[PDB]
Structure 1
């Protein structure tokens, strides 16, 4: 049907917009602490602590597979990254501090993306 093509022009386009949003969140992590999943070779105990791991390269994979049905799904992944990091790492660490900063700086970017999704459809 043509109504499934028009749906996909909207999914394709959400995916166009969410690409941009990811790029901007990832620029607020210049240290690249959240770029890649936490290594299980280097932290074998990690899944004892963090049941749903998340990172930017993993978000990217899902996005290029049009696997985010809306902005809320995308925002949940982003908060995983931050919240996982804030549990796993103690307060007086470069990792925890990096998450606080990424969250504070991400809020602005997300506040404008919410508006562009509602707006454009």
Structure 2
């Protein structure tokens, strides 16, 4: 494991703790969400993000945050605002962006000195 992989695994574990039912753990299938593949063209989930960390496919925290944002945005696009998925996606998105904020990453960058 490399330092970037350990950092991304830490952020991913913290985000995944906010989804105890595993709604974001693996891809959404059309069987459990009719028309999903017809509405969501760039699917994303925590399991795919984990595979990308293990394969060393993320060059930066910005790329990781972009996948996290895509996952939440997909749930808010497919699902209406009064649904469990939309509400959890909104809660998870705000918490993840606070955790990986520019202030937190600037403090972490300054600690690399």
- Give TM-score, length-normalised by structure 1: 0.81
Q: Which residue of 2 aligns with 1:71?
A: 61
Distance of 1:53 and 1:13 partners within structure 2: 27
Q: CA deviation at 1:44?
A: 5.3
Q: CA deviation at 1:43?
A: 3.2
Q: Which has the larger radius of gyration?
A: 1
Q: Which residue of 2 aligns with 1:107?
A: 97
- Contact 1:19–1:63 at 8 Å: present in 2 too? yes
1:72 and 1:29, CA in 2 relative to 1: closer, same or farther beyond 3 A? same
Question: Which of 13, 18, 33 does residue 3 from structure 2 map onto?
Answer: 13
What runs of 5+ residues in structure 2 fail to find an aligned partner? none
SS at 2:100 equivalent: helix
Q: What is the alpha-carbon root mean square deviation over aligned residues?
A: 2.0
- Contact 1:49–1:88 at 8 Å: present in 2 too? yes
Provide the aligned length of Structure 1 versus Structure 2.
Answer: 111
Question: Which of 39, 42, 58 does residue 32 from structure 2 map onto?
Answer: 42
CA deviation map 1:9-53 (0-9, x unaligned): 9xx211111111110111111232111110133335222101100
Q: Which residue of 2 aligns with 1:98?
A: 88
- Contact 1:25–1:109 at 8 Å: present in 2 too? no
Higher helix share goes to which structure?
1
- Give TM-score, length-normalised by structure 2: 0.86
